[PDB]
């Protein structure tokens, strides 16, 4: 993984030694080249994962997440460079450094072969993310949002640390390859009930689980656009990725420990989809959409079947590109009208035609229109949940109805109707903004042609 | 104070601590503490104001009381063993008295009340010595007597110190009192792991001293002693706000920073002894420390507080303070995690 | 060797350089009272260093290349604007007074540093000890609020306690009507707007507070307008002063070393002039301060520590 | 209150530069930024990367498995063996408890 770690580090000297007018050009160009070379990770085998060294490995689960992570850094740079234009030059370089350092922790987190190394990097992402939100957010509430983000994560992470060290003491290793062969079943006891909870609660908070999701509407709304892009696209997937790995060592106790959390998710998604129908803030609406989608990922991981793991992996990738695109779409409006209120600016399809096409395409992927990989993932999860219990089709079906209503409600309210008369600064969409939109949607729609590379290890 | 007198008194502070650390005889250990107490009082009074007089008086009364309890423990130990060798004590009542005496000297809860007040009442330079160098002698004694220490007593002191240190810091706006309550909390981690692995006590002590020295040195550089005066630093030395942010995050124990290393290793040693409830409780309680560290970062680095017109006159002069070792200390305070296996040098 | 405890130990002690001619002389009086000319003559005849009264741009004269900076780097406080609109809504009156006190505090430290390090006395024109007369005059005319006065006193208490008063205080007593005529003849349009009640307040404070206070600790020479014209007769008065009172008699090498360590560290001297007390007159919003601070660093020879600015010809930076 | 700058006015990049691409105020940097985004984003990563993915060598050996299965089916049906047995492991190598 050094062929990605080292060049990712070299982005930092590149940004700091660039001419004052080339920091965005240079960093964007070279983060795209790193993104290109990440495709070499798709040398995957049917039986064996790609094991580079004692420290890092890649498999069909981590590979697509790595490719998404390295692709997002260029997109976060283009999204940021407009609202940071007036920023002091050295503070601009520091902002880029936080994004680069976040990428470095992410690509190592998704490939660390030992769970305690995963834990340290899993936790190291808090620092740059917290700094990005609190330093470069716009509102007063960004300070409170950082505190909620920090302590919701840590309240779950600290028990995980104790559990992992306990597992290493008793098993003798936390290397994930070793855990595949030395795993022993977990027999019922109050001691093991709390080992299970400590192994799963840190990842549930990151997803987030319904009930523990309050940090996300605050954090995903107060953050600058780049912060929201990474929070929705990747950082939420640390929870899903972590669960997918650690559930190996939790069987068969997951049989009955999953019930309270499946209930929170099945009912949670219907609750958080319904919330989106009455949201007045466009960014808040998108954030609550992420909770609804990640509820399916939680259920798919917990029921633990070959189809649900394929569906969970597809959903995580598809949601990352969609949710990131929606935040970017809403940001373009915000950079014009300086407000997140959804009803403020209406009938925008009349004033910004092409950008209304992106809104439509983003909305269709969100409501899981076939054969998008959003539908592929969402359908595979529904297939496996039906087998788990047929009655779940009722809750999945209702959520699919509600999701279409709020996806098209957001499209109709902002893009259709009559334009607001007094808003007269809707300038035509910039090339940067159009390209930023097409760099989400085009890769997302291309993956439909070859969906096997985003279905994970159980394909 | 004459410069030569100041140096001689500082060397006597160190000599007293060194006497404690090289002595095989309880009488010389007690002498070392007394010599150390003698030489630090003039450092507390060096500015001669009613608050420094109160601080020194409260320090002398607490330290001199603890020394009496320490000498009582040594004499009881002599009666029941007929020897003075510095090692495990041979009487459980002697072990209680010595442990309480050392907890008093360390300012561990519930013997903690003097630490916030004494630190607030003395200069920053004197507070730096009080909260770092002065922990070495009592810790070195605990390191040698721990086999005879009552497990319930030492873990009770450790738990109360983490709670009271964490809660106490929440209500503070003065920097010296924030450092004092932080020190109380960190003492709890040091003595919690002492019964299990004394090596981890030394690592926590060493890392704590580095981070504490780094913070006091940065406060001294700007001559800041309140939260609000520290909030002007962004409009004078922007680099210093970043170093303060990194150290404060480190002191909170966040990966991938150095300050996470002691908590990591202490949890490991405790879980190896089937101590699960206590390390979980300690780590969660330490989130109180992180909370009021984070508040400082908010008012110092992550936002820009209002400034004053006269501050513009400061732009035209460079920092003149020595800031000795600060570049090294801040790097060690933040960037040591990849070298954690180096802790074996302390074995 | 930069002065410090090591220099003290090796022999750099104040009592070695200080003679009978190492005095700190302050010249005071009302506006257009002839202080400047009298101060310059006294310095030249007694062979001391002369410090022209500290104004708005005093600090610029001691750092950088010694030339005035744009007015945004002094807070935009204007003495001319104080005369035109003493009751300005942007708090210029007090902001100017707070800026001037800090400039005097800095000048006093510079004067003390020169006196302690070389033994040559100095001559000042007003000082931190007499700056309050303007504040009292401003408050009695209603140019500033009682809160501005409270802020001024808080800053003074924690700053003036660290220094020693002048050896000699020279006061030139010019009555107000004569001053009004003198201001009128001078010609500058803005100063003509000073009202007599304002000048009477300066005089009342000078005689009602400053002089009784200084008398207990300094030698005070009170001259009229005519006596002050011949600087030679004033110098004769200073030369036969007994110097039997004040805190200077209690000073020793130990104490003057502590004083020297303070006055040579200007950031320590100015430490409390920016205490976090949020008066509107002196509080600057974060967005304004950030912008001005960036522009200050973009001035010639101000980005880096003095001697490391290559834009202005500094060499050997890679070895310095 | 206090001494604070007023909120600066909004800057429309099109007034100074009608041909603005939205990247930079400087027209020359603005053109270069658009060029690198399009060339490295669309021409390199998306076009060549899509071509790379399409020609991946038998990703996860699904094509070898189909070839192998055909070989097994042919051999087993010719020799009369069952196509697939219920037992994955030979029961002669297993020692049941009790």
């Amino acid at each position: 993984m050094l062929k990605y770690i080292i060049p990712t580090i070299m982005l930092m000297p590149l940004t700091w030694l660039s001419k004052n007018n080339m920091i965005w050009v240079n960093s964007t160009a070279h983060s795209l080249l790193i993104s290109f070379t990440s495709l070499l990770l798709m040398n995957q085998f049917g039986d064996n994962s790609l094991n580079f060294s004692l420290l890092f490995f890649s498999d069909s689960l981590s590979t697509p997440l790595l490719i998404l992570t390295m692709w997002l850094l260029p997109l976060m740079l283009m999204a940021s460079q407009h609202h940071l234009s007036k920023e002091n030059l050295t503070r601009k370089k520091l902002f880029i450094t936080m994004l680069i350092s976040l990428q470095l922790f992410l690509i190592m987190t998704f490939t660390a072969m030992e769970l305690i190394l995963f834990y340290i990097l899993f936790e190291a992402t808090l620092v740059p993310t917290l700094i990005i939100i609190t330093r470069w957010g716009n509102q007063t509430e960004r300070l409170n949002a950082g505190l909620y983000f920090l302590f919701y994560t840590l309240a779950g992470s600290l028990p995980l640390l104790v559990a992992l060290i306990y597992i290493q003491n008793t098993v003798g290793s936390l290397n994930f390859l070793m855990l595949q062969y030395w795993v022993q079943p977990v027999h019922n006891s109050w001691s093991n009930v709390f080992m299970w909870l400590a192994c799963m609660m840190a990842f549930m908070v990151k997803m987030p689980l319904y009930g523990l999701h309050l940090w996300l509407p605050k954090a995903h709304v107060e953050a600058p656009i780049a912060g929201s892009m990474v929070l929705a696209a990747v950082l939420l997937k640390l929870g899903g990725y972590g669960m997918l790995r650690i559930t190996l060592i939790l069987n068969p106790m997951t049989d009955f420990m999953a019930y309270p959390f499946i209930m929170l998710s099945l009912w949670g998604m219907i609750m958080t989809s319904s919330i989106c129908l009455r949201q007045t803030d466009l960014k808040s609406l998108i954030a609550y959409s992420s909770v609804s989608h990640m509820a399916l990922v939680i259920v798919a991981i917990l029921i633990q079947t070959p189809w649900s793991y394929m569906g969970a992996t597809a959903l995580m990738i598809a949601h990352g590109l969609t949710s990131s695109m929606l935040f970017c779409l809403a940001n373009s409006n915000y950079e014009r009208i300086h407000s997140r209120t959804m009803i403020l600016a209406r009938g925008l399809q009349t004033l910004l035609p092409l950008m209304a096409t992106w809104w439509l395409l983003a909305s269709l992927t969100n409501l899981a229109l076939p054969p998008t990989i959003n539908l592929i993932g969402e359908l595979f999860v529904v297939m496996s949940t039906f087998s788990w219990s047929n009655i779940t089709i009722i809750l999945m079906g209702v959520n699919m109805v509600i999701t279409a209503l709020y996806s098209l409600y957001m499209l109709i309210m902002t893009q259709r109707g009559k334009y607001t008369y007094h808003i007269n600064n809707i300038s035509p969409s910039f090339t940067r903004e159009n390209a930023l939109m097409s760099l989400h949607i085009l890769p997302l729609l291309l993956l439909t042609l070859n969906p096997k590379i985003i279905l994970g290890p159980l394909y | 104070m004459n410069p030569i007198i100041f140096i001689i008194i500082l060397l006597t502070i160190m000599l007293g601590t060194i006497i404690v650390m090289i002595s095989s005889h309880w009488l010389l250990v007690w002498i070392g503490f007394e010599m150390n107490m003698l030489a630090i009082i003039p450092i507390m009074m060096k500015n001669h104001n009613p608050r420094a007089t109160e601080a020194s008086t409260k320090y002398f009364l607490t330290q001199s009381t603890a020394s009496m309890l320490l000498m009582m423990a040594v004499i009881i130990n002599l009666m029941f063993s007929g020897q003075w060798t510095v090692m495990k004590l041979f009487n459980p009542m002697a072990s209680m008295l010595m442990t309480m005496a050392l907890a008093m000297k360390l300012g561990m809860a519930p013997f903690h009340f003097w630490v916030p007040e004494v630190t607030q009442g003395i200069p920053l330079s004197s507070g730096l010595i009080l909260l770092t160098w002065q922990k070495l002698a009592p810790m070195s004694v605990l390191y040698q007597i721990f086999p005879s220490i009552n497990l319930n007593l030492i873990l009770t002191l450790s738990v109360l110190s983490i709670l009271i240190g964490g809660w106490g810091g929440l209500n503070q706006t003065q920097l010296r009192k924030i450092m004092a309550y932080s020190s109380i909390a960190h003492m709890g981690w040091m003595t919690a792991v002492l019964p299990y692995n004394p090596t981890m006590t030394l690592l926590n002590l060493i890392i704590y001293i580095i981070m504490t020295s780094t913070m006091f040195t940065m406060f001294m550089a700007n001559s800041t002693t309140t939260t609000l005066s520290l909030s002007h630093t962004w409009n004078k030395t922007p680099i210093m706000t970043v170093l303060i942010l990194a150290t404060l995050l480190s002191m909170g124990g966040l990966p991938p920073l150095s300050g996470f290393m002691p908590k990591w290793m202490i949890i490991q040693e405790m879980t190896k002894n089937n101590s699960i409830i206590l390390p979980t409780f300690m780590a969660i309680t330490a989130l109180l420390n992180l909370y009021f560290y984070m508040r400082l970062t908010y008012s110092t680095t992550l936002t820009m507080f209002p400034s004053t017109n006269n501050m513009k006159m400061k732009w035209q002069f460079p920092l003149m303070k020595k800031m000795t070792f600060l570049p090294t200390m801040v790097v060690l305070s933040t960037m040591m995690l990849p070298l954690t296996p180096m802790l074996s040098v302390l074995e | 060797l930069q002065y410090g405890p090591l220099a003290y130990i090796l022999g750099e002690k104040a009592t070695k350089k200080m003679t009978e001619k190492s005095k700190l002389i302050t010249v005071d009086g009302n506006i257009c009272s002839g202080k400047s000319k009298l101060a310059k003559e006294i310095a030249e005849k007694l062979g001391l260093k002369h410090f022209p009264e500290a104004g708005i741009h005093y600090v610029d004269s001691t750092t950088g290349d010694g030339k005035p900076l744009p007015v945004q780097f002094s807070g935009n406080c204007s003495l001319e604007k104080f005369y035109d609109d003493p009751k300005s809504n942007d708090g210029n009156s007090y902001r100017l007074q707070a800026w001037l006190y800090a400039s005097r505090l800095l000048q006093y430290a510079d004067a003390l540093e020169h006196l302690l390090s070389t033994g040559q006395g100095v001559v000042l024109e007003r000082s931190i000890y007499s700056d309050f007369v303007f504040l009292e005059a401003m408050y009695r005319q209603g140019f500033i609020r009682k809160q501005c006065v409270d802020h001024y006193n808080q800053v003074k208490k924690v700053t003036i306690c660290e220094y020693l008063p002048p050896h000699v205080v020279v006061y030139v007593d010019v009555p107000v009507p004569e001053v009004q005529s003198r201001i009128q003849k001078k010609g500058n349009p803005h100063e003509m707007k000073i009202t007599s009640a304002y000048l009477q307040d300066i005089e009342n404070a000078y005689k009602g507070t400053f002089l009784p206070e200084m008398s207990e600790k300094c030698e005070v020479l009170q001259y009229s307008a005519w006596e002050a014209q011949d600087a030679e007769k004033v110098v004769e008065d200073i030369e036969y002063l007994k110097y039997d009172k004040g805190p200077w008699l209690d000073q020793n090498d130990r104490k003057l070393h502590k004083l020297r360590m303070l006055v040579q560290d200007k950031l320590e001297v100015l430490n409390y002039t920016s205490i976090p007390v949020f008066l509107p007159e002196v509080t600057v919003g974060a967005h304004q301060s950030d912008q001005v601070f960036q522009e200050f660093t973009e001035l010639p020879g101000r980005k880096y520590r003095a001697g490391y600015n290559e834009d202005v010809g500094d060499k050997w930076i890679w070895l310095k | 209150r206090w001494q604070e700058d007023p909120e600066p006015e909004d800057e429309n990049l099109y007034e100074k530069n009608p041909d603005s691409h939205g990247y930079d105020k400087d027209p020359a940097v603005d053109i270069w930024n658009m060029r690198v985004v399009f060339f490295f984003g669309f021409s390199i990563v998306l076009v060549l990367g899509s071509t790379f993915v399409a020609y991946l060598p038998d990703y996860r050996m699904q094509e070898w498995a189909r070839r192998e299965a055909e070989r097994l089916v042919k051999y087993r049906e010719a020799h009369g063996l069952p196509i697939m047995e219920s037992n994955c492991f030979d029961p002669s190598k297993i020692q049941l408890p009790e």
Partner: peptide, 19 residues
């Protein structure tokens, strides 16, 4: 608008004897 930064009211939360 522009990024919010603490104003005097916010800053005085941290200027008292206690929090």
């Amino acid at each position: 608008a522009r990024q919010w930064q603490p104003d005097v009211e916010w800053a005085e939360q941290y200027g008292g004897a206690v929090m």
